[PDB]
Curated annotation (Swiss-Prot), chain A:
Species of provenance: Saccharomyces cerevisiae (strain ATCC 204508 / S288c) (Baker's yeast)
Subcellular location: Cytoplasm
Protein name listed in UniProt: Small ribosomal subunit protein uS13A
Family membership noted in the UniProt record: Belongs to the universal ribosomal protein uS13 family.
Gene Ontology cellular component list: cytoplasm; cytosol; cytosolic small ribosomal subunit; mitochondrion; small ribosomal subunit
UniProtKB/Swiss-Prot annotation, chain B:
Consequence the record notes for mutating R182A: Loss of RNA binding
Molecular function in Gene Ontology: RNA folding chaperone; rRNA primary transcript binding; single-stranded telomeric DNA binding; snoRNA binding
Part of the whole protein covered: 72 to 290 of 290
Limits of the Brix domain: 15-196
Gene designation per UniProt: IMP4
Name assigned to this protein: U3 small nucleolar ribonucleoprotein protein IMP4
Keyword Transport: no
Keywords, ordered alphabetically: Nucleus, Ribonucleoprotein, Ribosome biogenesis, rRNA processing
GO cellular component: 90S preribosome; Mpp10 complex; nucleolus; nucleoplasm; small-subunit processome
Taxonomic placement: Eukaryota, Fungi, Dikarya, Ascomycota, Saccharomycotina
Localization of this protein: Nucleus, Nucleolus
Broad class of the protein's primary localization: nucleus
Disulfide pairings: none
Oligomeric and partner information: Component of a heterotrimeric complex containing IMP3, IMP4 and MPP10. Interacts with MPP10. Component of the ribosomal small subunit (SSU) processome composed of at least 40 protein subunits and snoRNA U3.
Function as written in the Swiss-Prot or TrEMBL entry: Required for the early cleavages at sites A0, A1 and A2 during 18S ribosomal pre-RNA processing.
Swiss-Prot record, chain G:
Native source organism of the sequence: Saccharomyces cerevisiae (strain ATCC 204508 / S288c)
Subunit structure: Component of the small ribosomal subunit (SSU). Mature yeast ribosomes consist of a small (40S) and a large (60S) subunit. The 40S small subunit contains 1 molecule of ribosomal RNA (18S rRNA) and 33 different proteins (encoded by 57 genes). The large 60S subunit contains 3 rRNA molecules (25S, 5.8S and 5S rRNA) and 46 different proteins (encoded by 81 genes).
A GO molecular-function descriptor: structural constituent of ribosome
Major subcellular site: cytoplasm
Protein name as it appears in the record: Small ribosomal subunit protein eS25A
Record has Membrane as a keyword: no
Subcellular location: Cytoplasm
Name of encoding gene: RPS25A
Coiled coil: none
GO cellular component: cytosol; cytosolic small ribosomal subunit
Remaining remarks: It is presumed that the precursor part of S25 is engaged in assembling of the small subunit, thus being essential in ribosome maturation. Present with 322000 molecules/cell in log phase SD medium.
From Swiss-Prot, chain H:
Organism: Saccharomyces cerevisiae (strain ATCC 204508 / S288c) (Baker's yeast)
Function: Component of the ribosome, a large ribonucleoprotein complex responsible for the synthesis of proteins in the cell. The small ribosomal subunit (SSU) binds messenger RNAs (mRNAs) and translates the encoded message by selecting cognate aminoacyl-transfer RNA (tRNA) molecules. The large subunit (LSU) contains the ribosomal catalytic site termed the peptidyl transferase center (PTC), which catalyzes the formation of peptide bonds, thereby polymerizing the amino acids delivered by tRNAs into a polypeptide chain.
Keywords, alphabetical: Cytoplasm, Ribonucleoprotein, Ribosomal protein, Ribosome biogenesis
Coiled coil: none
Gene name of the encoded protein: RPS19A
Impact when changing R121E: Decreases mature 18S rRNA, protein binds 20S pre-RNA complex poorly. Lethal in double RPS19A/RPS19B mutant
Protein name, per record: Small ribosomal subunit protein eS19A
Family membership noted in the UniProt record: Belongs to the eukaryotic ribosomal protein eS19 family.
RNA sequence: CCUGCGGCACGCGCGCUACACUGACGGAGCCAGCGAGUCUAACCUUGGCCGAGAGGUCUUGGUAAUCUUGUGAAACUCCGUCGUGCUGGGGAUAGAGCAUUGUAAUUAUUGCUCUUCAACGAGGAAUUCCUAGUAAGCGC
């Protein structure tokens, strides 16, 4: 367990769901945070204080580069 | 001579009238129906909601009332008013412009509620005598010679202007003061049926769109 | 603290009582002899049983 | 009514002789009002009085006993049948349908009645029991035993 | 001023 | 021919046209069995004419009911009305009379709204 | 990183060393100070495995877990 | 002793048949199917992007079955809900046309429906068979 | 000794009526679970105002109870408890939500205290309804609290009011919904544990009325 | 915020919104009534097809208890996700793009799509409407 963490210059609070912890990043939708956990094969109902840095950057590679991971173009911010 | 609809009742039976409101009334006009309920005697206020105009008419001819007073409003300011005599009698949709509700002013008290004298001014036209005989029968017959409140219906400039007054008589002059609503009022259509009917014969109808519309009076 | 029930005989009319409060001659249930003129608060009719926390006071007018 | 044909000998012989009859005259001319119990038959026929004819319904005992006593309600809606094995079947009189089957006696029932108010019902057996029924409810009110 | 019937009772 | 009896059932603005004919014991509402009525809590509000009198008396009859108008609730008060009326008007026609007065006294003691339309016509005070 | 268990690896200790103590619901399981390094309601979950001898209650659910 | 889909409750039917067409595997779910919102006044795409298109075909089949023929403009209005306009009043809006048109072209390949005369789409004798089949399977779920 | 045979064939239907419903034709049960028999109002003077004699299936008798003065008494109190649950502008005119709460609430009272839910609800109303309530006097501008007695219809009306308000207020910002906290009320109001809303608030209304009488 | 009345930064009146768990969100269940609708023209519009949507498009029925339309309206119901955190409650302010009406949309006509995520934790003194299918909720 590691609490408050930094993803794409944004401090992500650890004791909440990653489907909702990613939504504190500016502009990214709730459904957009719902898709990336599905695309990165991450359990939706985990807390953000989980998720080892192996599975973190796979979310990062999808989130900062959407169009190379079959993300629909309307679904960006 | 009284009108043919009012002829059988004319002086014999007191009227009983109903003041009711349009549909989901604003709290300003739901006050204002009570000033109409107070301006006449024998007036009860039945709040209307999810009644239809058939089953509020048809459940009123049954119970037996002389006529029906329904109001409308714009954003709290009441605008319209109809009186409709029930035993297949006429109706008169009035537009009323300058209103001052009684609840705005001060807690000066409460009205006299006794039988009023009336004042009808400047009714010359035969259609003007229709509006006389259709308004006059909303009051209980035969007021006392010394009752103290008098209700004026004044017709300067085709807008029937009605005010409510009390009076006392001093050693020389009469001195009056105003209670109750100020109206301007204007009838604009006059059916021979009730306000239910909507295809009855139109005795009079305010034509707006006519080359000589602004010229005549009672037209 | 024993509680004595009472059955209502006759509501009282024309007595000048404060609004909301009505005045009632009750009859004791456990001994059908006595009566006590108590006041009610809610809506009451005859032939209903009323609950008295105290028997011996006998309520007068409330102006 | 049913459509299947009636079972009987084609050389028509008369009904076996009648040992118990009951008749209540209250609803005559609209359905049957005469119930007769024939000698040594497990059923017991009905008769219309006004048309002078055997009625269309026949009443069975449902426990293979001989009918020794019959009665009708004063309203003329219920037909009692007292079997020779205790069973008191109560058939209705419009349709001939079965409604209630009473079981108190063990020997032959030899008389039923219903009171005037259609409330209480009696029965008497060869075992000596005189049972007193309620009929609105189906409860046994009481039970009396004589000697013989 | 007492209401009548009460003024019977204290008289 | 076929013995039938047609009765109506009416709540707020919902009709209920219940044909009752001698048959095998199926009970349909809008071409669907009566175990599939919509509001799912008020399903026992329409089992009342089934279960008050006893489910035996439906063994020989059909109850075809079709409803229009109304809402979710005010149709359920129409199918419980037209099944009660459609049952108690078949025993006075094609079955025995003493059945009918047993039924009409059964639905009465439970709820009289099954039979006659409780019309909430207005009152002016 | 660092072990993916503790404080909650102690919260485990005092967890199964007090849960059998009380017990009650999830609003009550809210006590002991529920934080990250694990999860909230999930507590009762792995607590459905063994038992205790006491009560419980559900929310969006609906149960009286004899944990 | 015989079953029609009308003998099976609405949902438990479209539930077991939408999971029959997934195990069946031949449907042709089109190319997008994760990104579309399905309707007029919708907010989010379906909460189950796995089994929704098969949930919806399994609905569409039970609906054209019970009817003579129903077109695409008709599936929209059935599947359109109320749209929240925000600070404005709610009103009815038809669903997405491409979706329900691509359930119809795609149920003609498995033969569960066919072009009708008079217009629309109609259930095919083969799809009338399959639907009656699983209407029994669901009926018999009672062990 | 004696037997009545009233049913002659095994009654089976072409439409399958389930096993729990065909069993329900012997006694009428509330929500097909709860018997109105063996349910006694354990306080006299409250019989003829708490009406549990006529059994009912669901708590939805849509009959007219507002017209006469005391027609309100014969409402079967389980419905009269559901009617006081829809008292808020977020809640007016939603009865099927309220009936679904009570059927979920009456289950909870069983699971906790096995007895009956409906014996508890009757025993709740007997406890919380006050016995002497205090009224305001005129007194010529200086108002003192004058203590009087209370009619047994008001004893029921205010009892039902305090329970549902006590449940609606205690479940204001909690994970516990209306359904569970009301069962926390009625169980505590049955014992009169002074840890419920209404047993507390009665114990001012009978406290204040003792102070000035 | 919308609107009316005053005032000329503000005073007043009618109102709409939400503050959330009796909720929101996602599926799913699916039920009204009053109504309107095209000629010398472009009306109400099913159905098919295309578009995440808004909309587009090829066709059709209807001068109408005939076709739209069973206006499959909304609250509401169930199953699920959220878990009391200005939280997933609330959607103001605003950035960027795509549509529609129109000779003309800048001072945004409106609609749609993504992002931005404010006040507001039940509202002082005041004060409105209301007695049964009504009050209030809710859509047409």
């Amino acid at each position: 367990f590691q609490h408050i963490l930094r993803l794409l210059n944004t401090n992500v609070d650890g004791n909440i769901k990653i489907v909702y912890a990613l939504t504190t990043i500016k502009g990214v939708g709730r459904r957009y945070s719902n898709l990336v956990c599905k695309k990165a094969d991450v359990d939706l109902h985990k807390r953000a204080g989980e998720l080892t840095q192996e599975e973190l950057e796979r979310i990062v590679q999808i989130m900062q580069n959407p169009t190379h991971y079959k993300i629909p173009a309307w679904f960006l911010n | 001579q009284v009108d043919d609809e009012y002829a059988a009742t004319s002086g014999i039976m007191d009227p009983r009238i109903i003041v009711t409101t349009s549909r989901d009334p604003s709290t300003r006009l739901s006050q204002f129906a009570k000033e109409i309920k107070l301006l006449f005697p024998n007036a009860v206020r039945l709040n209307r909601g999810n009644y239809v105009m058939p089953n509020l008419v048809d459940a009123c001819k049954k119970s037996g009332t002389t006529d029906l007073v329904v109001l409308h409003e714009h954003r709290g300011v009441p605008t319209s008013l109809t009186i409709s005599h029930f035993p297949h009698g006429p109706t008169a949709q009035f537009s009323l412009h300058n209103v001052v509700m009684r609840h705005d002013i001060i807690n000066a008290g409460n009205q006299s509620e006794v039988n009023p004298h009336l004042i009808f001014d400047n009714f010359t036209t035969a259609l003007g005598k229709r509006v006389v005989c259709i308004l006059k029968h909303l009051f209980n017959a035969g007021p006392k010679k010394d009752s103290e409140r008098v209700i004026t219906f004044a017709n300067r400039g085709d807008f029937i202007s009605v005010r409510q007054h009390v009076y006392v008589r001093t050693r020389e002059g009469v001195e009056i003061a105003e209670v109750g609503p100020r109206f301007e009022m204007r009838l604009f259509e006059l059916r021979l049926g009730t306000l239910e009917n909507k295809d009855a014969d139109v005795e009079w109808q305010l034509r707006r769109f006519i080359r000589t519309a602004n010229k005549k009076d009672y037209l | 603290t024993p509680v004595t029930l009472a059955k209502v005989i006759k509501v009282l009319g024309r007595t000048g009582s404060r609004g909301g409060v009505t005045q009632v001659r009750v009859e004791f249930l456990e001994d059908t002899s006595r009566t006590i003129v108590r006041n009610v608060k809610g809506p009451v009719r005859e032939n209903d049983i009323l609950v008295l926390m105290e028997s011996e006071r006998e309520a007068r007018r409330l102006r | 009514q049913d459509g299947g044909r009636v079972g009987g000998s084609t050389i028509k012989s008369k009904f076996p002789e009648i040992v118990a009859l009951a008749i209540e005259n209250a609803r005559i001319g609209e359905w049957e009002n005469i119930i007769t119990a024939h000698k040594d038959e497990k059923f017991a026929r009905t008769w219309d009085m006004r048309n002078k004819r055997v009625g269309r319904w026949t009443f069975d005992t449902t426990d293979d006993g001989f009918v020794k006593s019959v009665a009708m309600s004063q309203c003329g809606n219920f037909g009692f049948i007292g079997s020779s094995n205790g069973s008191i079947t109560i058939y209705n009189m419009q349709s001939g349908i079965l409604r209630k089957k009473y079981k108190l006696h063990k020997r032959a029932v030899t008389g039923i009645s219903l009171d005037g108010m259609n409330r209480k019902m009696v029965s008497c057996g060869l075992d000596g029991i005189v049972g007193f029924y309620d009929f609105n409810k189906s409860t046994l009110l009481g039970k009396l035993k004589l000697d013989a | 001023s007492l209401k009548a019937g009460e003024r019977l009772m204290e008289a | 021919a076929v013995p039938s009896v047609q009765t109506f059932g009416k709540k707020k603005s919902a009709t209920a046209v219940a044909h009752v004919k001698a048959g095998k014991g199926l009970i349909k509402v809008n071409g669907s069995p009566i175990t599939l009525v919509e509001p799912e809590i008020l399903r026992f509000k329409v089992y009342e004419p089934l279960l008050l009198v006893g489910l035996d008396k439906f063994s020989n009859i059909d109850i075809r009911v079709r409803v229009t108008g109304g809402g979710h609730v005010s149709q359920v008060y129409a199918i419980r009305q037209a099944i009660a009326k459609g049952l108690v008007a078949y025993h006075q026609k094609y079955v025995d009379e003493q059945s009918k007065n047993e039924l009409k006294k059964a639905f009465t003691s439970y709820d009289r709204t099954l039979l006659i339309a409780d019309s909430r016509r207005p009152e002016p005070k | 990183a660092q072990h993916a268990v503790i404080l909650d690896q102690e919260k485990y200790d005092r967890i199964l060393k007090e849960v059998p103590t009380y017990r009650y619901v999830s609003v009550s399981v809210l006590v002991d100070r529920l934080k990250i390094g694990g999860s909230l309601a999930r507590i009762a979950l792995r607590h459905l495995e063994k038992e205790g001898i006491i009560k419980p209650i559900s929310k969006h659910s609906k149960q009286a877990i004899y944990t | 002793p015989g079953v029609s889909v009308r003998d099976v409750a609405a949902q438990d039917f479209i539930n077991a048949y939408a999971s029959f067409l997934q195990r069946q595997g031949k449907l042709e779910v089109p190319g997008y199917v994760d990104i579309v919102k399905t309707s007029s006044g919708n907010e989010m795409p379906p909460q189950d992007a796995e089994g929704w298109f098969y949930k919806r075909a399994a609905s569409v089949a039970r609906h054209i079955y019970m009817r003579k023929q129903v077109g695409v403009g008709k599936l929209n209005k059935l599947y359109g809900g109320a749209k929240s306009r925000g600070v404005r009043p709610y009103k009815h809006i038809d669903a997405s046309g491409s979706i329900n048109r691509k359930v119809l072209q795609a149920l003609e390949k498995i033969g569960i429906v066919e072009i009708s005369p008079k217009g629309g789409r109609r259930i095919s004798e083969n799809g009338q068979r399959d639907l009656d089949r699983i209407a029994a399977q669901t009926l018999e779920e009672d062990e | 000794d004696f037997e009545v045979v009233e049913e002659f064939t095994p009654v089976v239907l072409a439409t399958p009526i389930p096993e729990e419903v065909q069993q329900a034709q012997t006694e009428i049960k509330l929500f097909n679970k709860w018997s109105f028999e063996e349910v006694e109002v354990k306080d006299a003077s409250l019989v003829d105002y708490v009406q549990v004699r006529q059994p009912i299936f669901v708590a939805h008798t849509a009959g007219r109870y507002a017209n006469k003065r005391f027609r309100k008494a014969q409402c079967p109190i389980i419905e009269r408890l559901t009617n006081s649950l829809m008292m808020n502008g977020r809640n007016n005119g939603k009865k099927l939500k309220a009936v679904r709460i009570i059927k979920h609430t009456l289950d909870i009272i069983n699971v906790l205290t096995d007895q009956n839910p409906i014996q508890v609800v009757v025993d709740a109303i007997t406890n919380t309804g006050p016995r002497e309530d205090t009224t305001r006097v005129g007194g010529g501008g200086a108002a003192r609290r004058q203590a009087v007695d209370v009619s047994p219809l008001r004893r029921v009306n205010q009892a039902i009011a305090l329970l549902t308000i006590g449940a609606r207020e205690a479940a204001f910002r909690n994970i516990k919904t209306i359904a569970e906290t009301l069962a926390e009320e009625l169980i505590n109001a049955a014992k009169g544990s002074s840890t419920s809303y209404a047993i507390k608030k009665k114990d001012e209304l009978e406290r204040v009325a003792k102070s000035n009488r």
